[PDB]
């Protein structure tokens, strides 16, 4: 719950949104627009949508009180992807790559 | 099965 730990989270979030990772991060930038994409079963399968723009809003609004709450939202975003999409799908390979970025930097959390 | 291929 320290300021320092939340700044580490904010750094991770900025990195996930940065051009460095855009080739595989872009499916996670905005909420899944199920209607626009023709995914009429998406909200029957995914109970708690999450995406990086929502994480960013919650960070800016000071919604997150500790790093664990932030990590749970980021991991929820990936979990939704793993739930809705077959494991051999391109978007799942992108999720795995971005989650690799997230988990290895999140592990460097200041104590 | 999931989204359209990206």
């Amino acid at each position: 719950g320290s300021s320092e730990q939340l700044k580490h989270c904010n750094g991770i979030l900025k990195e996930l949104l940065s051009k460095k990772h855009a080739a595989y991060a872009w499916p996670f930038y905005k909420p899944v627009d199920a209607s626009a994409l023709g995914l009429h079963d998406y909200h029957d399968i995914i109970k708690h949508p999450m995406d990086l723009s929502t994480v960013k809003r919650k960070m800016e609004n000071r919604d997150y009180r500790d790093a664990q709450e932030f990590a749970a939202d980021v991991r929820l975003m990936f979990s939704n992807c793993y739930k809705y999409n077959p494991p051999d799908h391109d978007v799942v390979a992108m999720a795995r790559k971005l989650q690799d970025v997230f988990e290895f930097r999140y592990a460097k959390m200041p104590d | 099965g999931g989204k359209a291929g990206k």
Side-chain angles (χ1 to χ4, degrees):
Chain A
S2 67
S3 180
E4 168 164 27
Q5 290 165 248
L6 283 170
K7 288 193 178 287
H8 180 67
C9 294
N10 195 51
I12 295 168
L13 175 63
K14 292 292 183 214
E15 178 171 358
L16 297 184
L17 288 167
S18 71
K19 315 248 199 190
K20 178 181 194 172
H21 299 299
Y24 36 90
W26 69 263
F28 308 101
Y29 283 168
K30 290 292 154 70
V32 174
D33 189 339
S35 174
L37 290 174
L39 313 175
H40 302 303
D41 56 352
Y42 188 79
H43 296 291
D44 301 286
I45 294 172
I46 304 306
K47 172 176 184 179
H48 299 288
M50 185 54 55
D51 68 286
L52 289 174
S53 82
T54 298
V55 178
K56 179 176 173 278
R57 166 185 64 86
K58 291 176 65 169
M59 181 72 60
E60 294 171 337
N61 292 344
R62 286 186 276 179
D63 202 310
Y64 295 122
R65 292 199 71 231
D66 48 62
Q68 294 97 318
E69 189 181 357
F70 163 88
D73 271 354
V74 175
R75 289 164 173 157
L76 168 68
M77 177 184 77
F78 295 129
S79 296
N80 290 339
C81 187
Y82 306 146
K83 189 187 181 176
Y84 185 74
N85 298 279
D88 60 330
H89 194 297
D90 275 352
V91 69
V92 171
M94 296 167 90
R96 292 194 194 97
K97 289 165 65 167
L98 197 66
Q99 181 156 25
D100 193 75
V101 175
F102 167 77
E103 296 291 344
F104 279 78
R105 190 169 171 185
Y106 185 81
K108 300 182 182 321
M109 178 76 47
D111 293 341
Chain B
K3 313 169 158 170
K6 28 266 272 105

